[PDB]
Amino acid sequence: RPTFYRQELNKTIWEVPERYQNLSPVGSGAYGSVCAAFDTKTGLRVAVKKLSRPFQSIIHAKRTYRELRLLKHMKHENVIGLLDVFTPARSLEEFNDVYLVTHLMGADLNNIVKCQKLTDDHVQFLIYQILRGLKYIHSADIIHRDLKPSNLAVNEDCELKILDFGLVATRWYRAPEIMLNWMHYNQTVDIWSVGCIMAELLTGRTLFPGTDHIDQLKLILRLVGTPGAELLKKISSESARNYIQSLTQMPKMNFANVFIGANPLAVDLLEKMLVLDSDKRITAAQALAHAYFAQYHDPDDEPVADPYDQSFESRDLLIDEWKSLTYDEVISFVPPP
């Protein structure tokens, strides 16, 4: 066991091994707080997240296990994984805190979109990396479900990693099949979000800035047109169909016109990503082979993930059970060294 030291930071207490130095708060970053630190072992900067109230309820306990399992499995240059996981607890009975550590990128995608609008070459590289990460995530039977600029960490080299897979409105980037309230979507839910991100990097504005779920659907349909016969026949929900079909029929707009002087290859990719019918939407793997990425695509360097056991997802267990399981995962952790 290494030696731990203690400090208060922004009302929050931090108990970490001495090898992590110079902790500086960087945010309240979802179900926890986050510090940038210096890892004396490697000489590299890291991000340390202290989970908030990890065993507060069955919901929190399952979430904590889910995150730790997910982060332990992700081993890909475009997805965050773990350099370290630790707890100051000496035993299971004293176990109430989890700390996770990963390479510090230092910003999200949004932290660059401000005051800037990107050239084609940078859009190609950023989206290529997103898709490269999604191919890997999707190959593990994981759907991100909340891809958005704030969930993409980006360093000064413009290298990118996807955050928070598996677990600035989310609404703005979410596929229409999940706006409508359908729980039989597929992995191309995430491809829609990529399309919204790409559009925004090219134009400099949020593609679908809706003020609620209904307005969001309305903004989406103004661009992509209202459901045709084929799609309408796949919708079970009477309320969903009745609503959609109670709207004034709207045609698909010309993407070449909406995205005027963008690379026409980018416009072609965008029209294959932002298709209403998710059965017809391009996959991450297919998108990687698209002509837009000819300068980046290498099919021998776009790997897939090892088998991911998500059987825990169907299980209804007690807090002490999720807690003990999380504990075992902390103790069995093997780093990249």
Ligand X SMILES: Cc1ccc(C(N)=O)cc1-c1nnc2ccc(CCc3ccc(F)cc3F)cn12
- Decide if 75 contacts 333 (C-beta within 8 A): no
From the list 25, 29, 88, 225, which residue makes contact with ligand X (rule: CB under 6 A)? Answer: 29
The footprint of ligand X on this chain (CB under 6 A) covers a number of residues equal to 20
Residues 249-268 touching ligand X, rule: CB under 6 A, are: none
Whole-number minimum distance, CB 120 to ligand X, in Å? 25
Whole-number minimum distance, CB 103 to ligand X, in Å? 7
Task: Please name the amino acid found at residue 205.
Answer: R
Of 151, 172, 173, the C-alpha closest to 161 is 151
Whole-number minimum distance, CB 67 to ligand X, in Å? 8
Strand ranges for the chain from DSSP E? 4-9, 12-17, 20-28, 32-39, 44-51, 84-86, 99-103, 152-154, 160-162
Should residue 98 be labelled a site residue for ligand X when binding is judged by CB under 6 A?
no
From the list 80, 287, 288, 305, which residue makes contact with ligand X (rule: CB under 6 A)? Answer: 80
From the list 16, 23, 37, 47, which residue makes contact with ligand X (rule: CB under 6 A)? Answer: 47
From the list 79, 101, 198, 287, which residue makes contact with ligand X (rule: CB under 6 A)? Answer: 101
List the catalytic residue out of 39, 97, 108, 164. 164
**Per-residue x/- track, 286-325, ligand X (CB under 6 A):** ----------------------------------------
Whole-number minimum distance, CB 73 to ligand X, in Å? 13
Cα angle at 219 between 217 and 220, to 5 degrees? 60
DSSP three-state, residue 290:
coil
The alpha-helical segments, DSSP class H, found in the chain are 58-73, 110-113, 120-139, 176-179, 189-203, 213-224, 229-232, 238-246, 255-258, 264-273, 284-288, 319-331
Residue 279 annotated to the active site: no
- Decide if 208 contacts 223 (C-beta within 8 A): yes
- Can you give the C-alpha Rg of the chain in angstroms? 21
From the list 15, 25, 26, 285, which residue makes contact with ligand X (rule: CB under 6 A)? Answer: 26
The verdict on whether residue 34 carries a ligand-binding annotation is: yes
- Decide if 196 contacts 273 (C-beta within 8 A): no
- Decide if 112 contacts 195 (C-beta within 8 A): no
Should residue 197 be labelled a site residue for ligand X when binding is judged by CB under 6 A?
no
- The pair of three-digit structure tokens given for residue 128, joined into one six-digit string: 């290529």
Length of the chain: 337
The verdict on whether residue 29 carries a ligand-binding annotation is: yes
The verdict on whether residue 26 carries a ligand-binding annotation is: yes
Beta bridge pairs of residue 177:
none
The residue range among 104-112, 114-122, 198-206, 307-315 that interacts with ligand X, by the rule CB under 6 A, is 104-112
Q: Which is nearer to ligand X, 101 or 325 (CB)?
A: 101
Q: Which is nearer to ligand X, 116 or 254 (CB)?
A: 116
Give the distance, in angstroms, between the CA of residue 287 and the centroid of all CA atoms in the same chain. Answer: 18
Should residue 108 be labelled a site residue for ligand X when binding is judged by CB under 6 A?
yes
Should residue 64 be labelled a site residue for ligand X when binding is judged by CB under 6 A?
no
Residues 144-183 touching ligand X, rule: CB under 6 A, are: 153, 163
The residue range among 11-19, 106-114, 215-223, 296-304 that interacts with ligand X, by the rule CB under 6 A, is 106-114
Cα angle at 53 between 52 and 59, to 5 degrees? 110
Give the distance, in angstroms, between the CA of residue 123 and the centroid of all CA atoms in the same chain. Answer: 18
The CA-based dihedral angle spanning residues 147, 150, 156, 160, taken in that order and rounded to the nearest 10 degrees: -10
Should residue 220 be labelled a site residue for ligand X when binding is judged by CB under 6 A?
no
Q: Hey, which residues are catalytic here?
A: 164
Query: Where does this chain bind ligand X (CB under 6 A)?
Result: 26, 29, 34, 36, 47-49, 71, 80, 82, 100-102, 104-108, 153, 163
Binding residues for ATP: 26-34, 49
